[PDB]
Amino acid sequence: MSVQAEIGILDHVDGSSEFVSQDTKVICSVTGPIEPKARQELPTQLALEIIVRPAKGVATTREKVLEDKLRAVLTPLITRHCYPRQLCQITCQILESGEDEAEFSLRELSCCINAAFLALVDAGIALNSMCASIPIAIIKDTSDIIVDPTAEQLKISLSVHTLALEFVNGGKVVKNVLLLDSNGDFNEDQLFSLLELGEQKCQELVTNIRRIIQDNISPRLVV
Amino acid sequence: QDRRRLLGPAAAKPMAFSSEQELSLHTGFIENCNGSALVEARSLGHQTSLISAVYGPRSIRGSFTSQGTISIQLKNGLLEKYNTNELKEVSSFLMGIFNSVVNLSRYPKSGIDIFVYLTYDKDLTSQISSLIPHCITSITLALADAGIELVDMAGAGEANGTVVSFIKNGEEIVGFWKDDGDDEDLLECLDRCKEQYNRYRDLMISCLMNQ
Amino acid sequence: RLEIYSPEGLRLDGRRWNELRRFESSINTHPHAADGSSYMEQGNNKIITLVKGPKEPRLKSQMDTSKALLNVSVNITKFSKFERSKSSHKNERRVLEIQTSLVRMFEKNVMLNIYPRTVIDIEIHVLEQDGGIMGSLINGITLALIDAGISMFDYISGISVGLYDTTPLLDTNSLEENAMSTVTLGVVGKSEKLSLLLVEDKIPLDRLENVLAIGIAGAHRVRDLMDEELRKHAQKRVSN
Amino acid sequence: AKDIEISASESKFILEALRQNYRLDGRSFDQFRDVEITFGKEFGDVSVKMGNTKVHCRISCQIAQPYEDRPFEGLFVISTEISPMAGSQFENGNITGEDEVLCSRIIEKSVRRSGALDVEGLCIVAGSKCWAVRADVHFLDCDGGFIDASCIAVMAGLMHFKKPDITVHGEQIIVHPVNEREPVPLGILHIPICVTFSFFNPQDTEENIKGETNSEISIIDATLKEELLRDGVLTVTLNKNREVVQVSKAGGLPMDALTLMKCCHEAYSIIEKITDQILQLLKEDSEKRNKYAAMLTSENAR
Amino acid sequence: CLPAEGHDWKAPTKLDDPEAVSKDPLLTKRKDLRDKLICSIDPPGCVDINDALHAKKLPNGNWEVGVHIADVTHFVKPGTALDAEGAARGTSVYLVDKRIDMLPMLLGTDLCSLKPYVDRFAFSVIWELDDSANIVNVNFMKSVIRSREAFSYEQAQLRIDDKTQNDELTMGMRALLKLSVKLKQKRLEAGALNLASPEVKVHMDSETSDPNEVEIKKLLATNSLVEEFMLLANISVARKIYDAFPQTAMLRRHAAPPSTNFEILNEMLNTRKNMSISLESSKALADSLDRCVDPEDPYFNTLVRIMSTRCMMAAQYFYSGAYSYPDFRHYGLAVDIYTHFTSPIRRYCDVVAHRQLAGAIGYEPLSLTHRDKNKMDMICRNINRKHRNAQFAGRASIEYYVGQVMRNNESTETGYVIKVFNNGIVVLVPKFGVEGLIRLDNLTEDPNSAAFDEVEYKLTFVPTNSDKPRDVYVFDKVEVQVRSVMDPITSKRKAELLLK
């Protein structure tokens, strides 16, 4: 396989999703809009308090760096002014990484971002645009780009890159780039190659997630 | 490791091992702080630099308090190693001096956050006794720069591991410390430290006079 | 290593198979700054309890219209073992576990209903343990609360049984604890209804009745000392 | 943390449903929900679902220093840290943590104190090197059933789990990859499975305590609303050999020894059933992992 | 790296078949031979087919024998995962009812097995013998064969006793039995004791990797028939590889007895019965063991023969990187150059030697592994060790099971005392081949009636269920049983080897 996504699986929470990308498997919940804690009351804004918890061992400093990365992306995805003075806690539990957690975060991160989008779709919280994120590596053997890499391919990386882009006017016009985190050595001609490919490979992923939400929503909402 | 901070490999262990002074003052040199001071002391023995920063008056509302309070953090140097408890003692010492010197009645619901950074102490040749003049010089400057009320400038000498702090031109004592000095030093030390206090008094006044 | 029992009915303390340990107690060990207090000896388990309060807390969140808030703090110092405790224990699961057990249990024994907008703090300081300590802590609480004038339904009395296959040995020490499976039990009042049964070890289910039945007798035996101790004290302070 | 506010009418209603001898789920008081065990695509990933209650366990091992008191054993540490995917009354690791401790402690009392995982054999080098086995139990959905589900998640997790084949020479441990040589499964001494009896009073405490009547509603395998609403609990844990591994009873409704032991006896039938279910599910997933391993057997007849 | 066909595979008829010349392109160098009748000469109820053999007559008055060894070199290549696995195990270990395969089950017992009625690849060593049994020439090639019937030793034996099947397989087998007794006489002539006898064979290391038995028994003159043809095929190979490369050639030997074991063995025979054996030469051993006979005990020859083979040094696989040609001695096979290739299925060494032989004739290139010292030497050491442990283990496995059966029948059987200690005796039970220590302690009424003379090798104790003293001599008959007796350190019984 490639990717699979389901929504609605969890029943006690306002919205939820299960994102699986090959070996990598992230299950997500959005809870809220709910009653703010006083330290997480913000005046005009919805608050975000994101938690990433790894499968193996217990969450550390790493997951805060991930939280920041997630929080960056999610702040213009969720309509902040939609709820003033309410909190939303997004709790992302990793059921399998299937890689090495300290070393590579490429698949882990991309998966969380997508499960967060879906969960928020199920939740009903306003979403301006479609977001997905794809993982891109470069392997040293050919000294070239391999899109959507497996666990083996990640080991033999010299460098690794995630991109996330905001999708409007048919979910197919790139509005903006909400992330481009390019770690390891790159020079510019690769990097604009990673955008280019990146564009088209994202838009496929957007098609697939788009399709999934319609099919799963449609027997629920009927007329 | 830990959930609040990265501590690397945990079965890993440290490496095993193999007026006579000039105080020159500075203030108002870094910003995000209501006032700051810098004290560097050079002596034959050891050279040292101490940074201080004072934050607030801050409001501490949701409770009414009789008067304000002072809270002292000492932070372990990056080239000096001390037990946490000693830093507590010295924090406690300095608080009780400052309690007596800072006037606290113009400020209801107040907490003041004082930070003492004991950054560099280096020997070319206890130890914690010796840097007490320098801590007291630093912090006073900082309270003055910020606009925090004070009875008199606070300042002290160190004669023979004995520290005596005075205010009012040597007339009143606001604290006394003796730790591993010799029995019956009292007259030598008080005479010797008065000299020291009068000497650093005016230095602080002249730092405050360039602004 | 070592005998735990013999057909001749001895131990290496020299107790009998339904004999109790040394039970010594005295009440009012802090009668100048604690509302009730009691000292509990069972063996060498040396337990002091203080009850401080009933008092209102000065935090609104700890105020409760429907009943008092109850706090039980189990403090275990660094000299309860034979050696110096290297570890922090006042921030350990084992101790929070005892806390969560004593509080939920005494919360129903004590009437907190008749003390609304109150907080009670039970403060339990261990000075030594030599095992049989989990039943000994219950007993010290029970004498503290009755001294403090804090109403109750009954006395809970803690007692331990170690089963040496089919041979149940009432009361325990360090050897007994570390060399077989121990049961710990509590009964409330002279009832057969058990408040607390705690088992950390494989006890067979087929023999489950044999260890509890001797323990519910064994419990009654502890409870009459508690009354005797208390009425000898109450008679003293009503003569004067 | 923020808790669920139910009505007085709810409280009345659920008691009356027990009194008149039904349940909300259409269950019996003695009926346990079907647990389904979904073994991963990796060793020691187990998804454990009982109806809506969804829990996971992932097992990890690492090379670790023994402790000072007994350096001839290894380490079992149970994280039953909980994040809000079941409510908001559990948040941010520990924030109250009463339930964390109790579930963690009972699972330790079951697997390490009594034995249900070998610990002697966790020493690679005594007093130097050992395995540390970490069970991280993460609930994703809860509908009561908390201890029961967590336990099954710990033991299926451990049984499916496997650890690097190691060779020692001196104190140097050559750690061998899990494609290089086949990883070794853990030692299992017993199968603890819990059954949590949630006790509800039809009277009030005062009439209960010096009464002797038994008319107490005994139910297992509570719902979320039931978990909150229970006046008392007995958590009893047995293995499939007629021995009680651990008992946690400490607060709630008192009970005669006969009634407690009744409970134990009921649970003893129910745990063979779960144990059985677990056995045959493990087998059929194992058959698919064994499908060419059967071909390449080195234990063959002469 | 195990081939996907391997449960349905048949080998080609043509070497101009499409698929065939894409699978193996080295195939043009692999001779078609499948049209000449071959038959296999194997164990009754064989555990696998390791070999096939034929003999045919040329009208020009030569007899041509081909040793058709299983080919593992088309399916496994060096440095593969399968190879690496195969190297790790190093031997195939036979036990009492477990066989512990060196290669997977279907690779070893189906594919590389030379099944009847199925076309299969082999490496042919084909060599011509004159009637007086001297090698006229010898060919090394790769091949394609079929075997048409796989015979058991018994069937092969009965086909020798028929005279009215006068097909190639019958005539073949009769001439093979005729040639074989000459070839064996050459080895004895040069200087060797019998090793072909069943009794000797079981207490020594295997030449083909043959299983050690449940109960040791006379085996057939057909078992003896196939030993010699393999021996000389191994010898033909030895010389070739030495030519191919002389410093990294894979080799095997055993060596002469040390002085002290031999000196002490003789000393016991000397004092006991004034019989003596020699350490001059392996010829002088053969002559001296021949001359040591008694009809007082009729197993006397057999027994000294066994003892001599234990004191003789165990087989060591090695390389010619650190030994010179005069150092390749054998002290019972009477050769100065040797290898083992018999069955690359069972034994790793045989696969090393195989690849070197395939590279010798240019079928492959010589691989780097087999043409430098140190890559050869590390492996030689490992596999050498693995074979000893295996052989010891196969004997240990027999021993404890014969302890079961001896106890189950509740039998008492004729053994011979081989060693006599001051508080025990070692008894050799040679109707099953097992050896065990009888602890005197468990077989005495009092430890202080044990009278031992060390210069004469003779024990005396007073038994339990006698009231009189019983002498036990070294090298004499004793009636030994396995029987339950009470434990001294437990409160129960255990079955111990004991005398009446």
Side-chain angles (χ1 to χ4, degrees), chain E residues 41-52:
Chain E
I41 318 177
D42 314 296
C46 64
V47 286
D48 63 276
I49 295 162
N50 64 304
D51 46 78

Side-chain angles (χ1 to χ4, degrees), chain D residues 295-302, chain E residues 95-97 99-100 212 214:
Chain D
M295 295 201 163
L296 307 152
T297 44
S298 315
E299 291 178 304
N300 290 282
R302 184 173 71 151
Chain E
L95 309 95
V96 286
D97 273 85
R99 171 196 192 269
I100 300 275
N212 223 114
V214 312

